[PDB]
Fold Proline-tRNA Synthetase.
Amino acid sequence: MLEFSEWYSDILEKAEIYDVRYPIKGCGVYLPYGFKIRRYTFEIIRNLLDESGHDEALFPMLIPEDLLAKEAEHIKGFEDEVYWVTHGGKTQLDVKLALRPTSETPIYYMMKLWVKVHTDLPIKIYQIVNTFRYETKHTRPLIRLREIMTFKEAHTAHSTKEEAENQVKEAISIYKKFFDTLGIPYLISKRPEWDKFPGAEYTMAFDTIFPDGRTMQIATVHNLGQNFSKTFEIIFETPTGDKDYAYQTCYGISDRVIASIIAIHGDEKGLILPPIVAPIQVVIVPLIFKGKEDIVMEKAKEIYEKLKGKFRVHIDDRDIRPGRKFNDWEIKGVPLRIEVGPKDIENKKITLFRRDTMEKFQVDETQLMEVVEKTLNNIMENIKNRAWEKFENFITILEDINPDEIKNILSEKRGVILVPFKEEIYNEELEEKVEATILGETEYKGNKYIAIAKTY
Amino acid sequence: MLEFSEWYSDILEKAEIYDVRYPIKGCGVYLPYGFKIRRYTFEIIRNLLDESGHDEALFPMLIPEDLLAKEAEHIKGFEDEVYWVTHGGKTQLDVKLALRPTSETPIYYMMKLWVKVHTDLPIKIYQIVNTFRYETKHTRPLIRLREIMTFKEAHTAHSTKEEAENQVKEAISIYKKFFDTLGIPYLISKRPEWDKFPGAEYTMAFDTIFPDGRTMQIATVHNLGQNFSKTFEIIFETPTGDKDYAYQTCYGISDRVIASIIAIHGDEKGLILPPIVAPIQVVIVPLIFKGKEDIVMEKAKEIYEKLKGKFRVHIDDRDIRPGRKFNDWEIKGVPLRIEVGPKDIENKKITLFRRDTMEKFQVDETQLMEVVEKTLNNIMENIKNRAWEKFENFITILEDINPDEIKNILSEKRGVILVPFKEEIYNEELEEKVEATILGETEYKGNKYIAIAKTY
């Protein structure tokens, strides 16, 4: 019965996902549940990056004036939003250490110390650190944050413009396949040549449209070529002896996913989060009755141990109206829930609940495992479609660039606006024209269109 | 032949663990093999924590002055070694946020809200973050650092004083077993009063002894009692409508573990980290020759898939002189090593290598999954037993409170010293009497001694 903004802000608490009362506005704390629904959230990208030949490592958080000074050119749109550590306690530091906004500055300074010959390449390295960002605008939970809680930034370096180029497509493939297992409707774009990362040749970026019509970039890939490699003397000996600066390329994702995981799927009753990330995929509720209280709790365990292997199960020993329980777990979006009842075991059956369609059925205790699996899949497959449908439904594919029309069709329909692509009038005016924000170039079934839309 | 000092520093990097070349005193970067090794290193403590009623949370890293203030009565040698943020671009912050040293202040400002009724306690909460202590002193990679990248800090609240007590006696046990599965030898002191914590009643701690006879502190535990509850107004209606202040009790462990891991179990040749935490437990080196090539890379994977499930393996490809690998892998501490030439295949045999003894025995192939499984349980054991041995050989027990004696027995045997406990002379003077350091009481073999030693 409430609009997104507060529904989100609400559930993002009633779900015990992220307390935000920490005295800083931009720095909330990930409560137990949230953390979990993140451990399993990133474990997915970690694996996709590990199988893909990446290697995670951890870099410092403090970037000194020196290096950071390289990140920019004059003081370009960068240093302006950065925290600085000036006092080394009571005294000054002689060295203005800074809180890592991005984190490439220190990683590149390092690749130098690692890349010497052409055999050192490539070094697709990544990390999931916590960056910062002096945010002047308004903060928004798990989205626009003063202190970003989960920021996975991958870095890779190659020996050629071609290897780099391809690395981007591999990444894009990773992020794609990643979101998919998370079930997140994405629209892949090529940020215009004026919304470019600092020193990037061009940028690709996954954008999704939250339930409010507003879009939100969640994933990002940039191709850097040598723009950095130079500034950081990250050179190397071509297989011919001669010297050549390395071709970088980086990509990152932030808490914005978990925000989107929350929204995209979450419903009025609260969460719904995909089973691939359910801190508890299945909840076992032992309904205690005056008679045969013991047997039930026994059945609970039997079910636990059985599901325990392939799945994440939890039981509500707790003393309280199964209601609050049923309700408490629905809000938390636990995919499946098993009611362990008396008149229920007597018939040799056990009853489940799909926290997605909220439909409740029974089934033979001898097919549990098979069911829980199939049911748990069906759910994902479903929530994933529901996700895609609401997505595709928000996407309007115009056939012509009438600006006075787009801004008009965006203040009623919203979501994203795809119009045929023609370099012609594809400049910054277009935005100061449609008065929106060009998500950039994009291909949607065949050729390329331009993606216009309202952003977060 | 070499000295521990550089032996450490040398391998830390020689083995791809921690690269301290990052331009900031004690602020290096964990390299891939470094991160990996620390992952499992720390997945243990996690589980131990999880499987014991704790919840992993994540709190902001920036504490505003306001708080870290009450984090003291005035300005007692504490706000001196704290990193402070002051600007946002070029605009001062007027609020002064600081880099978290003990990340407790916030977790308490927070408890202020999650506590209201006894129902809400106990709450055992922890996070494995990274702190920042401005250290003037000489840094020690993975030991005394300026940025402690891996600092798992637990925190607990209790309605009653006694509950806390058993919570500390629980923390210990946990760590005890944590370090037992890691193979580290420890000496649970009880830090003497005169040496306090910001606001702790009594502070328990675990000590280990590096091969250079200096003692290292791997674990610390506190009973913060109400000292903190009172300042952060952590009140809660007792089960009698009264207003009682919660009983705190925190504890954490730093990178010292992975440090104590390397140090303690390392040997001349290279690094010999325990199987549990072995980034790589088994390495299949398919020695490939001109003849019978594929055939080899075949039994390479026949062994992979075979072990793939219960163990972490790595077929070390690399078009390089096998001996280099064997050498390389011995350094990184990989426990078991597999070499599969064309002989063992025709003889239906297999050839293994044990890092702990550098022995190279063979055994039937059908008996693979069997050996490895069993061999490892041996290696880890064999190396743990060694460790204690050495440890026990660094602990010298006396019988008299003779300072002019102890001090001497140090610069002749080092390690840690125990002496019969006599409240009489268990004061700060005793330190200045042996110009060393006291670790506190300690129940080794019952007797209840007084550990004294030089420390890192």
Chain A touches chain B through 52 residues (CB under 8 Å).
